């Protein structure tokens, strides 16, 4: 009570680079949320129903390093800024949110879980404003119901003068819409 989270680092800088080049990652994967990195950027992926979902503005068209080699995206939708890869073995897959609660939580890359009030299909307000610097690198992180089901993934921050009052996210309905058209 309530939802809590913690992070575990699995890779160093040099291992990251090499894995980027071979596309081979033999590590045990675990957790609901993966911490991801490219040469220039870090961000998050949320595993929902066997797909690891993240933002296009983080991952572009890239493969994900995997045990059998690089994994090709099974879903790429650029205009909604959503991509997904079939979830590697061991990723804990979450449940889409049904009930419709407007009381949400955003899980950041620092594994903080922060209260968000849903204001619309794709938007929610931070109950406490945070500096933009604190949210950076959290795109792809989950927005959750109090029960722990996923309502969407973090896309962009609404901010002024380095302070974010609200967040824009990709609703889990956009994901199945992609799983429809694709």
């Amino acid at each position: 009570a309530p939802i809590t989270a913690y992070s575990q680092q699995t890779r160093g800088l040099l291992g990251c680079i090499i894995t980027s080049l071979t596309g081979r990652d033999k590590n045990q994967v675990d957790g609901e949320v993966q911490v991801l990195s490219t040469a220039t950027q870090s961000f998050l992926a949320t595993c929902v129903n066997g797909v690891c979902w993240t933002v296009y503005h983080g991952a572009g068209s890239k493969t994900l390093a995997g045990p059998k080699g690089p994994i090709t995206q099974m879903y790429t939708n650029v205009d909604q800024d959503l991509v997904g890869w079939p979830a590697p073995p061991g990723a804990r897959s979450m449940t889409p949110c049904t009930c419709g609660s407007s009381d949400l939580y955003l899980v950041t890359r620092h594994a903080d879980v922060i209260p968000v009030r849903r204001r619309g299909d794709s938007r929610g307000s931070l109950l406490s404003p945070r500096p933009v610097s604190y949210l950076k690198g959290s795109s792809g992180g989950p927005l959750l119901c109090p029960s722990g089901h996923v309502v969407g993934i973090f896309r962009a921050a609404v901010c002024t003068r380095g302070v974010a009052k609200a967040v824009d996210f990709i609703p889990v309905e956009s994901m199945e819409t992609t799983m429809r058209a694709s």
Partner: peptide
């Protein structure tokens, strides 16, 4: 041009 790489994970309770 490299792959995206999982460098960590977050465990939810």
């Amino acid at each position: 041009k490299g792959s995206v790489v999982i460098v960590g994970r977050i465990i939810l309770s």
